[PDB]
C-alpha cells in the first residue's frame, strides 16, 4: 500500500527508465544473470551465454529486457490496481516458466542496483523507498497467486 506521494515518486523514477527502456532492461537482466547464475538456467534462449561480453552483445537479451520492463511499467502505472495485468504474469511464471518467488526478489533488488548505477546521485532516498515499496507490492501480489496455485 502506497500513498499518492509515493506513487508520484515511483512514476517520476520510471520516467528515467522510459527514456532508455532497452538499456535499462539489458542491464537489469545482466545484473540478475551475473549475480545469480542459476537464474540463467530458466531461460532456454539465454543459457548459451557464458560471458558477460556475450550477454552485452546479445540483441535478443536487450529485446527481452524491453518486454520485461514494458510489462512492469504497465503494472506500475496502475498504482496498485493491477489485478488484471498481474494475473497472467503470475500464472505464466508459476506454471510455465517455474520461477520461484526468490528470483522475483533477486530481480527487484537488481532494479534498485541498476537505477543507482545509471543515475548516481539522482536516485534519492525517498525515491528508493517508494520504488522498493512498489516492487514489494508487486512481489506480494504475485506471492498470493503462487500460494493459490501451490507453487514453490
Ligand atoms: C519484474 C519481473 C518480471 C516481469 C515483469 C516479467 C515479465 C515477463 C514477460 C512479459 C514475459 C513474456 C510473456 C510471458 O511468458 O508471460 C516473460 C517471460 C519469461 N520470464 Fe519473466 N518477468 C519477470 C521476472 C522473471 C524472472 C525473475 C525470471 C527468471 C529468473 C523470469 C523468467 C521468464 C522466462 C524464462 C520467460 C520466457 C522467456 C522466453 O523463452 O521467451 N521472469 N517475463
Can you list the domains of the chain with their CATH numbers?
Answer: 1-152 (1.10.490.10)
Biggest alpha carbon distance in the chain?
44
Residues 6+ apart with CB under 8 A from 61: 26, 29, 30, 46, 49, 55
This structure's resolution (angstroms)? Answer: 1.4
- Interval between CA 67 and ligand 1 midpoint (Å): 8
Are the C-beta atoms of residues 79 and 99 closer than 8 Å to each other? no
State in Å, rounded, how far the first CA of the chain is from the last one.
25
Experimental technique, in short, is X-ray
- Closest residue by Cα to atom 35, ligand 1, is 43
Residues with a CB atom less than 6 Å from ligand 1: 39, 42-45, 67-68, 71-72, 89, 92-93, 97, 99, 103-104, 107
> Is 116 annotated as belonging to a binding site?
no
> 113-119 long-range CB contacts below 8 Å, 24 or more apart?
113/31, 114/24, 114/27, 114/28, 114/31, 115/13, 115/16, 115/17, 117/27, 118/16, 118/23, 118/24, 118/27, 119/16
- Closest residue by Cα to atom 38, ligand 1, is 43
The set of cell numbers assigned to 143 is: 506471492
| Cα atoms found within 13 Å of the Cα of residue 107, Cβ hemisphere only | 21
Amino acid at each position: 500500500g502506497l500513498s499518492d506521494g509515493e506513487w508520484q515518486q515511483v512514476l517520476n523514477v520510471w520516467g528515467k527508465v522510459e527514456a532508455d527502456i532497452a538499456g535499462h532492461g539489458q542491464e537489469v537482466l545482466i545484473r540478475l544473470f551475473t549475480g545469480h547464475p542459476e537464474t540463467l538456467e530458466k531461460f532456454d534462449k539465454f543459457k548459451h551465454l557464458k560471458t558477460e561480453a556475450e550477454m552485452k552483445a546479445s540483441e535478443d537479451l536487450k529485446k527481452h529486457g524491453t518486454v520485461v520492463l514494458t510489462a512492469l511499467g504497465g503494472i506500475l502505472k496502475k498504482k496498485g490496481h493491477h489485478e488484471a495485468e498481474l494475473k497472467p504474469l503470475a500464472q505464466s511464471h508459476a506454471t510455465k516458466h517455474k520461477i520461484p518467488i526468490k528470483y522475483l526478489e533477486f530481480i527487484s533488488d537488481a532494479i534498485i542496483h541498476v537505477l543507482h548505477s545509471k543515475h548516481p546521485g539522482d536516485f534519492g532516498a525517498d525515491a528508493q523507498g517508494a520504488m522498493t515499496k512498489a516492487l514489494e507490492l508487486f512481489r506480494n501480489d504475485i506471492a498470493a497467486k503462487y500460494k493459490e496455485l501451490g507453487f514453490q
